[model samples]
Target chain A: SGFRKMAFPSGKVEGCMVQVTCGTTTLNGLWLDDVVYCPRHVICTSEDMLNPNYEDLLIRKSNHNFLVQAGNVQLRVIGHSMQNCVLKLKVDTANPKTPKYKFVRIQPGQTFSVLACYNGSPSGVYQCAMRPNFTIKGSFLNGSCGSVGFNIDYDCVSFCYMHHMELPTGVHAGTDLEGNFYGPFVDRQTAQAAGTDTTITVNVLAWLYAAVINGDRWFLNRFTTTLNDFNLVAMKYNYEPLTQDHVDILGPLSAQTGIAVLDMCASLKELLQNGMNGRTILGSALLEDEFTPFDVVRQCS
Target chain B: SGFRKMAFPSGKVEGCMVQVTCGTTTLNGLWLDDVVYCPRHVICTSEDMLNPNYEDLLIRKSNHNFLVQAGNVQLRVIGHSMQNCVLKLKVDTANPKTPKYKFVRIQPGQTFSVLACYNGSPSGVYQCAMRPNFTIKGSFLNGSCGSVGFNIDYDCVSFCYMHHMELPTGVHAGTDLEGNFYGPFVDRQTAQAAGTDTTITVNVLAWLYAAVINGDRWFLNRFTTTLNDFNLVAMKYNYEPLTQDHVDILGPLSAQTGIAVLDMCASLKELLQNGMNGRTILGSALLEDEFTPFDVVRQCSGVTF
Candidate 1:
């Protein structure tokens, strides 16, 4: 058994926010468990989850890293590693011997992998500790251990996941930049299907995040409705209809409304046969004063 | 000789301008001449008639009983005697009782009439003396002389001939008033023939007097032109035409311009045909442009020229 101990400065991680950027890597079957302990609440047990007064622990595993924030504290991971690679976590502020959580493993050859954390409180100083673990030949082991860290005595600021993506300069929403995320998908089914075709899934997530932050409720609703309509139209036509009108009308209302072109055509045909006749059209009184030679000619002819 | 004198205050006739509403009556076959005089030019002889100095007489006329400007004075007679009326004259402004001229016989039974005298200077006052000689009888005696007097005065500001006619209120030229000297002419020929009718020989002296007074050059020109045109058109059609077109085209222009309607129509026809087309029909362009589609189709389908 290999054992390591790490400790951060006092009040280092309090009142901080963090973001995670998942790059080109796919997180198919990864499990993450994180535990955090404040000096006032030493153990962040599962029973303490619902209590806001207690220091909290969060765990998430995707193609991204975890982000944690406290007062004047920041931390990030910006590299790729093969599966079963173990890295150590340490802090620069407190005694070098104490450690925080240990990472389990990193996938192989992940590109543009980034994890960032920000301290949003006025207290400037912070300390962070991380540890990496891996299984080699069916046995788990703690690999190389080196305590690496930096000081964040500067002002606390908010950051988002997009800051870590490889977005080009001056690229933003509502602009003309190509290949940028535009919106949230219609629903999960549409989203999953869309993912197989392109990176629209990622774009959708980006767009949703931006929408939420910018309070663009209408844009999100419209995007979702449009996507749902498109999916319905595609499914009904067996993906054959190319006309915009056909697609637009058929898609969104088909499932529930059941109004189709055939029904409209039938109604029109009925109207044409029964709705046109001179007796029905000219249903008015004829006055003697209004009659003239031209009127007689027209009536007789 | 019966004579009377009337008084007009100083300002009453000084600035007056007059028009002769009636001509001499009872003056037929009478040769009439007259002169006005003042103290300044006490004796204005009718013999020196080149252009008498009316200003002195007008000033004198403004004084005493004759309150009027001395100017181009006229003396007119009215009655049946006007056809042979005559005048002999001298003027003495200072002596009212001194006779100015020998008594001359005047024609009788003519009509009411006028004599007008106007200021010689452009800015001088105009005055008039009317002698409604209806008083004169057949032998130039027993003239209706009840108020037949000299230097009579009128109260109105202006006078016109329609007032003398007594036809109706607001009767003017172009109105159908009684006793209008001209017309009942059926056509241009009749109108022209009436001009030459010996029974209706117009007063030559009156015409000349009017011509001199009014400078009626345009009226004379128009009168002559109308007469000539009427003669020509009357000769052409005898006031009757075989077709209505000739009458329709010629009638109005001849009446308005005093030219022969037929001659005017011929001139118009010649001018129209002088261009490209050899034959000209009146209203050809109007016929083409204004005809309806149905009319054109019907007329063209069954046309016989």
Candidate 2:
């Protein structure tokens, strides 16, 4: 929820009607949608158009009401009479022939600012364009060009929400477990610089599946940072199918119903152990006990 | 001229009968025009249909009754079997889809040799096919993929005399007087194993042009061994349409008429120096004629001085 501002000049042109066109269009098209006047100025009337020298092009929060899906975005400005104007914000897209935003009617001593929102989506670069037709400027000003003034929330859980889920045993969880995931994970530098308490929850179920199927114990270790790199390399060489023996053991577990049978087995193993946490199990588990009969027969024999 | 013996597995096929097609007409048209083929084989007959293999495809020198100019020649074989065989020769034009030459009845064991006449026209590395379809085998036995061989005639002149001269200046000469001049000298590598002589005359001209245009003397000195490298760097910065000043200087020297004037100057300077070569005068006359008014003037001023 941070903001940026850009400005444009306004005054008398020596001898010409000045016009400004700005947009997100990469190529020439037959329309202009995202248009706004400078915060300090009003719309140009027919009489004003007769002798308009410069026009203020302000991009404030009100003018910037568009929503970008948390990724790179670009704004282009193409206009006339833009000279010696210092642009306050950076652009985000490439391709110079068709720019994203343009500023027009800019007099000699004018300045503009473009507000860029960097909500740390990933660790990569982004670009934009602000091509001034009457003047020539470099393609874009890099987003990483400014000072550190904004606070960003970096908790992985806050940024990501549960989009959908399938039960471990393949049972219908229904409405009991579904939600949308959103993120505000800003850039890496801000997250590391702030040293905020960001909890990154690693799903144990997904990690177990990866380890058993891919024979990768690194994901199971949890503390390793090279898991993503290893996964990328393994995927490149087609390493996902598990051995027949491992698949055979876990394949039937997915078809079972109810959690009571698993609880009983856990209690029995705990009782046979030499030390245990303070917990007792009480149940007449309504299923055929396969392990119990084998244990009893082995003891009697 | 040398003769080559070739054998085809099938002597002839019905619709795919072997016939040489040259230009826009069949070989039969050229034979009727009284074009004699001597040491060369120009014989083609319906009698070829009698035998079905090597005997019918045989081409003897005695059968070559037509005459051919030293350089003007047409393709020999054309048919379905020609698709399998390849000829090692340079094309006067570039058309990859349908090449100028196609072979007839070529089997795995088939072989042929080319008889080259002129020096430069015959002696270079001639590739087999203009297109992918008729690629020639480089090897005879073990390498059986594509074949390449040198045609050397030390006593012959380096020229191709096939096409008629449309312009007097189009023909190669010792001097040029009033047309666009391309290359006056070529650098050839005599030692084959040295792997191509890196030095060439045209390369030197391009280097000089680049150096003078950019006003970089250091680059000019390095241009001898690194012409290709310099071209890459120059292109990256968009350094085309070199400065007008450099163009003016090089334009005169490369023009046909300018070359003639320069040649006359050279002869005059040589006569003045008596025993000195033209190279010596060109190198020193520049410093001696500092008093000259025109900046682009050639230094050799004497007319048989």
Candidate 3:
């Protein structure tokens, strides 16, 4: 059964040496330019988040668990250099008057720099709203500083939120059908149940629904990815009625399943938008709001 | 000389038979869930733009060239069905009061749907400001229509702007380092000059910068992608100084190269934001603005740069 050959009515025959199949469609820039491919799996990341949108003060960076040994490990600025950039700890976003960490300088082209270490020392869960200070020629007339522009060849490491989640006994962690690691996010139980043909994203949405149902604050706190307000806003307008089966399996909280899903997504959006204030509901500071000036993720340290 | 051995200081050895190398870093959802893999080349596409955000009326959909044969060739709506969805031709977005095309109904799960056709009969370049009409239950109390929600199993086809561009004689078209196709968008000249290690994106940005320097309207009108205002806005705030070498090849219009690039990006953002009015600069209707409610792209059959 595993070695069966198949032919189409159009006289096309297909066989596989490896588990080859047609995957989802992605944009050219995203697949070719942004994604990192590794031998064991593929690592998805944001574009150098320090300045994805062109707004000042906001920064977006991706952090990894110590378990991540390979894949796009280098962090550098896109249009600028790392020369004489300073990295400072953003202590309390609500109260910027609080004390700050000693800022450090980053040189150009250094590899595998670490952002934070997680072990017995401080089994703490927190986000470093790491703001870097530097200067740049704003226009022909003015040069700016503070959150002007700066970068460093560095990598931030943290305990993935997925690593801390309490799972049902015998349940495994999350991996794609192709076996790619989904660091701190997603799990296998809900993903496999979403139907084999569905994208991992459906799994993420389903998992978020489950978290909201259980009211898992820890999961929501360490939850770092954005709900993509741009995308969510689209879905809200074009409301698609979710099937009873979809609701039953994915666990919707209301009869208006579509609205329920949007509500959950809105909650996730609020979690990121409210920033450090998210601590009230999520139990930790989320700096992604500062990162993109929109819905994005926080780089944990 | 045809073959060589390469090892890092850490003793990692690598070899390639068909030109495999370390590519760039991307996010998991984007790669595993969104990308479409094919035999000859990879086809990148946006998520079904019909309704990305929770807000209604705005829709985002990707169209294709009749030339595209494989790779994510189907168009279906997510989170909904094609039960009673209707597709209409947006006659003029600036004047929605203008007459509209006969809206058509779509059934569920129909594959390989065609949106628009370009041939000798029309030889026209325009966007199908496609607005599907239907109804959906909102918040349990409100059931909405007009742009409430509707979808179809269909694909829109167009003559790529790249197919019409006047490239320099003897200069071919755009392709990535790995020989994958870049539909109608990027070209060989500027891309190869961006440095071997740079991503194809850098090439795309360089191509846009070149277009801005030349003030090429045809390129601009047919230019159907969003500058990702989200990303451009980030770079503007960070304000990184560009190198003279970077400026020389990419063709900046001003001394403040970073700001110039931002200005160019802002122009692109406005183009998508303004939609049909984009015809003023681009010379054709661009409907991507109504699609995403933010900066994204107008799928041209993927000038697939």
Candidate 4:
């Protein structure tokens, strides 16, 4: 019963090798550029207490605001208003008012670099409506996005209006930087490295999907090798490869992060274009976006 | 390389040629009606920046205001609003005070059409935050999307949303208004054709993911074959097999709009039932709801270097 020969009326005849099939999810993206594969790993995450649109804050301002992992806490401004606006921040330790603060100016964007910060910590990216003005109208994050120029970080990768607006390290990938200003944010050194040089990407599942139809085994071969790279990620961060429990999290995984597949074909493309100088750019760093918070089993509500 | 031989460990030693291993979004909706394959692709646009939810809008008020690609400029009222409220629109263009202005009356929800306008424009969709008004919200695209039902024309398909929730010319691919009011928005005649009928859909990365686990290669074979039909899209629309810059853009790409191997399979099922007549009747659009503005590139911080 397991071995069957099938032939189509159209003249194509083939043997079928069947195995138990397990379903998969969230994996699609098109090549935006030669080396740049854009994946659509939808992670609609908005931590209720994290920022705009959340009901926790007092008087809200705009949702355009976002938090960066610069330190314990940082509110990088994403819009105009309060040009020199007073932002009374309170890190509010056990004693309250202990929260250090910083005031600075930023524009409607993300370089994944620091725009503003003060006292910092590890967990909880909370808020304390400073100046009773703890109210920073997060209203912008919640609006339809257009010319008003919008970006409400859902997790570490997703930007409100973007399709799969992700950065190599922006979120779950672990390196946790925001995003790059340009495309193919490839590193020269790594691109030229020995063995298997990888470019970790949120397009993990995406690469898998694309490879599925690749009648030719090229894309899938690289993908098989790429999948094994997750072990490094596991040991590197004390995390999981989006296991069962983590998948059950409340909303999307990160406020600014989404996920994708490693473009197993990227390095080969770069190489063909730039000779060996381009190195073997793989999706190693992509683990940051794919790794789920280990604490998810306990933290997910 | 395409002619390689392969095999697995725990199986009956049957076929000789084998290659290698592998695997891999969401969305949902059901059109119980025989012809109703209504898989609403709710983009809920708000470039005028709108939503945890919304239908994609006319002048597109907050279901958060969105922008239609209107010529000079236009903000279509995708629904009723401001029961008896006033919306002061300021359009500052060319020169600074060169700003034009208008007051509007809108409603609480999008019954699918009707709202008002006068003051509109060409500029950033910024807000004027006003109140004397407990509802100066539209200042940020007119009003709130809560009591507000929204619509922002995300595509040629997607209508069961509300009235006026459409494109410049949309509705029924059968009539060929050009993709709408239906899932793939495929047509009846074209749908009934002999030339491998197709429906270009943005099931986006979604349909790809689910079809991943399908047991038969017939679907993938057809999908791969269907994708080739896009040679015209390349020359016609300045797009690719979803290339880099293309992926930079939002949504799906298909030549027949390309048919999902799943749809092909579904039709095979329906054909089993009503046979040929069922062949003419099309569209079974859907998967579970993996819809996230998942393509994060477009979600990039409008922040440029």
Q: Weakest 10 consecutive residues, lDDT, candidate 4 chain B? A: B1-10
The reply for model 4, stretches above 4 Å from the true place, is: A1-218, A222-301, B1-305
lDDT of 4 at A87: 20
Candidate 2's error at A128, in angstroms? 27
Q: If you assessed candidate 2 against the hidden native complex, which CAPRI class would it receive?
A: incorrect
RMSD per prediction, one decimal? 51.5, 31.3, 29.8, 25.7
Q: Model 3, range A1-301, lDDT digits (tens) per residue?
A: 0000000010000000001001111110000122211111111122322232222212222222112211122222122111111111111112211112112322111111111111111000111111111110011100000101111212111111111111232112222212222333231223221111111222234434433332443434322323354255424433222333433434433332333544554554443344333232211122111111011111100
Q: Candidate 4 residues A1-301, lDDT tens each?
A: 0000100010000001001000121211111111111111111132321232212231343423322222233323333121011121221122221112121222111111111101111000111010111111111111111101111122111121111122222111101112121233221212211222222222233222322322213222332224345544432433224333322331243231222233332332332234322111121111112112221211121
Q: Interface RMSD, candidate 3?
A: 29.7
For candidate 1, lDDT tens digit of each residue in A1-301?
0000111121222222122212221111111113211111111222442352321222222212433222234333232222111111121233221223232221111011111112221111111111111100010001100111222112221111111111111111110011112232110111111111111121122222222222222222211224444434334422222234433433332232343323322322232234322211111111011111221121112
**Candidate whose DockQ is highest:** 4
Tens-digit lDDT track for model 3 on B1-305? 00000000100000000110012211110000222111111111123222223122222322222122112232221221111111121111122111111223321111111111111110001111111111100111000001011111122121111111112221122212122222333311232211111112222334344333324334343222234543454244332223344334334333423335445444544433453332322111211112111001111111110
Question: Taking the tens digit of each residue's C-alpha lDDT, what string does model 2 give over B1-305?
Answer: 00001111110100011122222212211111122111001122324323323223333222222222222443332211111112112223322222122222221111222111121121101111101111122211111111111111121111111110112111111101111111222111121111111211222233232223223222111112233443343334322222334334445433523332223223322323342222222112111211111111211110100
lDDT of 3 at B76: 23
Better of 3 and 4 by lDDT: 3
What are the DockQ scores of the candidates, in order? 0.00, 0.01, 0.01, 0.02
TM-scores of the candidates in the order shown:
0.13, 0.15, 0.18, 0.20
Better of 2 and 3 by lDDT: 3
Highest TM-score model number: 4
